[PDB]
Amino acid sequence: PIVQNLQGQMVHQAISPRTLNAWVKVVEEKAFSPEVIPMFSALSEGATPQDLNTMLNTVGGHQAAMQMLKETINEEAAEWDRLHPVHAGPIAPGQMREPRGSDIAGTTSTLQEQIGWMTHNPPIPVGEIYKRWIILGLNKIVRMYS
């Protein structure tokens, strides 16, 4: 995740095993229960898209649920692109890059780009945006249940 350091900088920190252990445990016990959503949120504070994918990729099994989540993420990514259109061609200077849906999901963006966006002024909170998409998906996994 992104955290504040002593000197006021929003700096990148590695996802702790403590967080991942807690996530694995809630998925094992609460994957299809409402409680997975608050726990997901609580365990992904300041998370980059990379962190969120790390969390999701530790999910063993739950194939149908994971496909439902991926469907939702893809729908939101497609929607993002439509609501945030961009022009073709090279960006003028050496520094820039507007986030596309696949960037927010962390498939076509690097961590440094994600940090770049998240720490820009004003922030482009790609971590929070992706988190919303995941939560939308988790709500479908709960709402459709079986």
mmCIF file of C-alpha atoms in Angstrom:
data_model
loop_
_atom_site.group_PDB
_atom_site.id
_atom_site.type_symbol
_atom_site.label_atom_id
_atom_site.label_comp_id
_atom_site.label_asym_id
_atom_site.label_seq_id
_atom_site.Cartn_x
_atom_site.Cartn_y
_atom_site.Cartn_z
ATOM 1 C CA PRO A 1 0.000 0.000 0.000
ATOM 2 C CA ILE A 2 0.729 3.732 0.076
ATOM 3 C CA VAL A 3 1.536 5.092 3.548
ATOM 4 C CA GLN A 4 2.720 8.389 5.028
ATOM 5 C CA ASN A 5 6.386 8.401 6.054
ATOM 6 C CA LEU A 6 7.907 10.697 8.692
ATOM 7 C CA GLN A 7 8.768 13.424 6.171
ATOM 8 C CA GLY A 8 5.183 13.689 4.876
ATOM 9 C CA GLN A 9 5.776 11.677 1.689
ATOM 10 C CA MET A 10 3.154 9.218 0.475
ATOM 11 C CA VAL A 11 5.513 6.257 -0.009
ATOM 12 C CA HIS A 12 4.972 2.676 -1.168
ATOM 13 C CA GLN A 13 5.007 -0.095 1.427
ATOM 14 C CA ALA A 14 4.833 -3.846 0.848
ATOM 15 C CA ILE A 15 1.613 -5.671 1.729
ATOM 16 C CA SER A 16 2.315 -7.382 5.060
ATOM 17 C CA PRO A 17 1.934 -11.179 5.549
ATOM 18 C CA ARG A 18 -0.336 -10.225 8.469
ATOM 19 C CA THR A 19 -2.747 -8.597 6.005
ATOM 20 C CA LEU A 20 -2.526 -11.478 3.513
ATOM 21 C CA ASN A 21 -2.958 -14.087 6.263
ATOM 22 C CA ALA A 22 -6.057 -12.249 7.493
ATOM 23 C CA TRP A 23 -7.434 -12.034 3.941
ATOM 24 C CA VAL A 24 -6.839 -15.721 3.186
ATOM 25 C CA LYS A 25 -8.639 -16.533 6.457
ATOM 26 C CA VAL A 26 -11.742 -14.437 5.700
ATOM 27 C CA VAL A 27 -11.950 -15.938 2.199
ATOM 28 C CA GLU A 28 -11.704 -19.454 3.661
ATOM 29 C CA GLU A 29 -14.449 -18.738 6.200
ATOM 30 C CA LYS A 30 -16.565 -15.908 4.756
ATOM 31 C CA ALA A 31 -16.155 -15.986 0.952
ATOM 32 C CA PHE A 32 -19.925 -16.093 0.365
ATOM 33 C CA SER A 33 -20.895 -14.149 3.505
ATOM 34 C CA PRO A 34 -21.628 -10.374 3.797
ATOM 35 C CA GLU A 35 -18.672 -10.058 6.187
ATOM 36 C CA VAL A 36 -16.164 -10.541 3.344
ATOM 37 C CA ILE A 37 -16.914 -7.032 2.032
ATOM 38 C CA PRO A 38 -16.064 -4.994 5.206
ATOM 39 C CA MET A 39 -13.037 -7.226 5.824
ATOM 40 C CA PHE A 40 -11.831 -6.742 2.247
ATOM 41 C CA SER A 41 -12.197 -2.980 2.734
ATOM 42 C CA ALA A 42 -10.481 -3.005 6.139
ATOM 43 C CA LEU A 43 -7.561 -5.048 4.765
ATOM 44 C CA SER A 44 -7.023 -2.897 1.652
ATOM 45 C CA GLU A 45 -6.508 0.568 3.163
ATOM 46 C CA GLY A 46 -4.090 2.579 1.005
ATOM 47 C CA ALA A 47 -3.837 -0.364 -1.408
ATOM 48 C CA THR A 48 -2.423 -0.039 -4.914
ATOM 49 C CA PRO A 49 -4.029 -2.068 -7.753
ATOM 50 C CA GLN A 50 -0.975 -4.338 -7.495
ATOM 51 C CA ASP A 51 -1.765 -4.987 -3.813
ATOM 52 C CA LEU A 52 -5.394 -5.719 -4.669
ATOM 53 C CA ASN A 53 -4.347 -8.198 -7.364
ATOM 54 C CA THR A 54 -1.913 -9.787 -4.898
ATOM 55 C CA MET A 55 -4.867 -10.219 -2.522
ATOM 56 C CA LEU A 56 -7.150 -11.636 -5.226
ATOM 57 C CA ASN A 57 -4.458 -13.981 -6.586
ATOM 58 C CA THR A 58 -4.024 -15.631 -3.166
ATOM 59 C CA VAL A 59 -7.647 -16.816 -3.423
ATOM 60 C CA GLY A 60 -7.321 -20.577 -3.894
ATOM 61 C CA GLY A 61 -10.283 -22.160 -5.694
ATOM 62 C CA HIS A 62 -13.630 -20.328 -5.698
ATOM 63 C CA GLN A 63 -13.537 -20.500 -9.498
ATOM 64 C CA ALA A 64 -17.122 -19.413 -10.213
ATOM 65 C CA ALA A 65 -16.866 -16.540 -7.722
ATOM 66 C CA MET A 66 -13.536 -15.403 -9.186
ATOM 67 C CA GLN A 67 -15.015 -15.448 -12.697
ATOM 68 C CA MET A 68 -17.922 -13.327 -11.422
ATOM 69 C CA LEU A 69 -15.436 -10.886 -9.891
ATOM 70 C CA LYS A 70 -13.392 -10.732 -13.115
ATOM 71 C CA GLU A 71 -16.575 -10.147 -15.129
ATOM 72 C CA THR A 72 -17.467 -7.183 -12.908
ATOM 73 C CA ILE A 73 -13.936 -5.756 -13.068
ATOM 74 C CA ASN A 74 -13.989 -5.990 -16.868
ATOM 75 C CA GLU A 75 -17.418 -4.325 -17.041
ATOM 76 C CA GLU A 76 -16.158 -1.493 -14.823
ATOM 77 C CA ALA A 77 -12.938 -1.166 -16.848
ATOM 78 C CA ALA A 78 -14.935 -0.878 -20.083
ATOM 79 C CA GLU A 79 -17.233 1.667 -18.454
ATOM 80 C CA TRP A 80 -14.218 3.623 -17.169
ATOM 81 C CA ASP A 81 -12.786 3.949 -20.681
ATOM 82 C CA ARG A 82 -16.132 5.213 -22.009
ATOM 83 C CA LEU A 83 -16.578 7.757 -19.196
ATOM 84 C CA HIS A 84 -12.958 8.921 -19.461
ATOM 85 C CA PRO A 85 -12.213 9.178 -23.220
ATOM 86 C CA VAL A 86 -8.695 9.892 -24.469
ATOM 87 C CA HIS A 87 -7.200 10.999 -27.784
ATOM 88 C CA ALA A 88 -4.821 8.836 -29.818
ATOM 89 C CA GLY A 89 -1.137 9.659 -30.288
ATOM 90 C CA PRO A 90 1.947 10.403 -28.123
ATOM 91 C CA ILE A 91 1.510 12.463 -24.963
ATOM 92 C CA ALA A 92 3.310 15.761 -25.516
ATOM 93 C CA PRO A 93 6.228 15.647 -22.982
ATOM 94 C CA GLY A 94 8.262 12.904 -21.303
ATOM 95 C CA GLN A 95 5.984 12.828 -18.256
ATOM 96 C CA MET A 96 2.216 11.991 -18.169
ATOM 97 C CA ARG A 97 -0.184 9.047 -18.968
ATOM 98 C CA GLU A 98 -3.927 8.994 -18.368
ATOM 99 C CA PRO A 99 -5.236 5.818 -16.628
ATOM 100 C CA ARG A 100 -7.260 3.368 -18.747
ATOM 101 C CA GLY A 101 -9.568 0.668 -17.268
ATOM 102 C CA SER A 102 -6.882 -1.995 -17.577
ATOM 103 C CA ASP A 103 -4.421 0.327 -15.814
ATOM 104 C CA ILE A 104 -6.713 0.765 -12.805
ATOM 105 C CA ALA A 105 -7.114 -3.030 -12.624
ATOM 106 C CA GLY A 106 -3.302 -3.268 -12.645
ATOM 107 C CA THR A 107 -3.071 -5.490 -15.738
ATOM 108 C CA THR A 108 -1.451 -2.953 -18.083
ATOM 109 C CA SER A 109 0.077 -0.605 -15.488
ATOM 110 C CA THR A 110 3.265 -0.954 -13.439
ATOM 111 C CA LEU A 111 3.488 -0.236 -9.708
ATOM 112 C CA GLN A 112 5.501 2.949 -10.312
ATOM 113 C CA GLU A 113 2.765 4.244 -12.632
ATOM 114 C CA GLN A 114 0.150 3.368 -9.994
ATOM 115 C CA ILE A 115 2.174 5.206 -7.338
ATOM 116 C CA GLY A 116 2.533 8.086 -9.809
ATOM 117 C CA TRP A 117 -1.239 8.395 -10.258
ATOM 118 C CA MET A 118 -2.051 7.835 -6.580
ATOM 119 C CA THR A 119 0.466 10.448 -5.392
ATOM 120 C CA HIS A 120 -0.257 13.012 -8.132
ATOM 121 C CA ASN A 121 -1.737 16.386 -7.147
ATOM 122 C CA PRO A 122 -4.635 16.106 -7.385
ATOM 123 C CA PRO A 123 -4.597 12.309 -6.724
ATOM 124 C CA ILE A 124 -5.854 9.925 -9.392
ATOM 125 C CA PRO A 125 -6.873 7.262 -6.821
ATOM 126 C CA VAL A 126 -6.570 4.157 -8.995
ATOM 127 C CA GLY A 127 -6.346 1.961 -5.883
ATOM 128 C CA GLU A 128 -9.657 3.272 -4.533
ATOM 129 C CA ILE A 129 -11.309 3.047 -7.966
ATOM 130 C CA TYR A 130 -10.268 -0.593 -8.389
ATOM 131 C CA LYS A 131 -11.363 -1.291 -4.801
ATOM 132 C CA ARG A 132 -14.868 -0.067 -5.667
ATOM 133 C CA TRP A 133 -14.945 -2.400 -8.688
ATOM 134 C CA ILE A 134 -13.893 -5.357 -6.530
ATOM 135 C CA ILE A 135 -16.527 -4.485 -3.908
ATOM 136 C CA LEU A 136 -19.162 -4.301 -6.654
ATOM 137 C CA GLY A 137 -18.061 -7.826 -7.584
ATOM 138 C CA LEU A 138 -18.025 -9.091 -3.991
ATOM 139 C CA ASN A 139 -21.598 -7.831 -3.569
ATOM 140 C CA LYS A 140 -22.635 -9.973 -6.557
ATOM 141 C CA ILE A 141 -20.888 -13.020 -5.052
ATOM 142 C CA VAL A 142 -22.877 -12.398 -1.867
ATOM 143 C CA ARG A 143 -26.121 -11.357 -3.598
ATOM 144 C CA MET A 144 -26.214 -14.294 -6.033
ATOM 145 C CA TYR A 145 -24.722 -16.730 -3.479
ATOM 146 C CA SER A 146 -26.394 -20.119 -4.041
#
